[PDB]
Amino acid sequence: KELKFLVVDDFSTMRRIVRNLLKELGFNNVEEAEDGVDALNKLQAGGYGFVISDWNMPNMDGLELLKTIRADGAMSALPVLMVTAEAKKENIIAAAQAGASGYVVKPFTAATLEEKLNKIFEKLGM
Ligand SMILES: [Mg+2]
């Protein structure tokens, strides 16, 4: 599957981990973004096929980034995997209403990530 991923997380250590987990699953075309604003700049360049986004981030959080993607004429169907942390239980109902493609709690292993990605590829038909 030739898919270009965008990994968005305000902690540089976590972006690196997720990127290396994707590399182990065979995905080598992975770009990183620091928050929702940075993510908008990368997405506008085009070519992205999947977004993995942390929920809590400064400047623009994962929910506002999701809602922006979903309102965009060309990118409204872009899959978005929402990432939450044990620290805070998020407003899942709002992400579900905005069309999140799925949810996963970090930290996660490549095995868990693979199972989440396979489930989304199947449910959406990618
Ligand atoms: Mg964060």
Swiss-Prot record:
Record-linked Gene3D superfamilies: 3.40.50.2300
Record PTM 4-aspartylphosphate, positions in chain: 54
Cofactor note: Binds 1 Mg(2+) ion per subunit.
Cofactor field: Mg(2+)
PTM comment, free text: Phosphorylated by CheA or acetylated by acetyl-CoA synthetase, depending on which acetate metabolism pathway is available.
Cellular component GO terms held in the UniProt record: cytoplasm
PROSITE patterns: RESPONSE_REGULATORY
Residue intervals of the Response regulatory domain: 4-121
Modified residues (N6-acetyllysine): 89, 106
Localization: Cytoplasm
Alphabetical UniProt keywords: Acetylation, Chemotaxis, Cytoplasm, Flagellar rotation, Magnesium, Metal-binding, Phosphoprotein, Two-component regulatory system
Source organism superkingdom: Bacteria
Molecular function as annotated in GO: metal ion binding
Main subcellular location of this protein, as a coarse class: cytoplasm
GO biological process, one term: phosphorelay signal transduction system
Binding site for Mg(2+): 9-10, 54, 56
Alphabetical list of PANTHER family matching this protein: TWO-COMPONENT RESPONSE REGULATOR, TWO-COMPONENT RESPONSE REGULATOR ARR22
Purpose: Involved in the transmission of sensory signals from the chemoreceptors to the flagellar motors. In its active (phosphorylated or acetylated) form, CheY exhibits enhanced binding to a switch component, FliM, at the flagellar motor which induces a change from counterclockwise to clockwise flagellar rotation.
Name of the molecule in the record: Chemotaxis protein CheY
Source organism of the structure: Shigella flexneri
Gene label: cheY
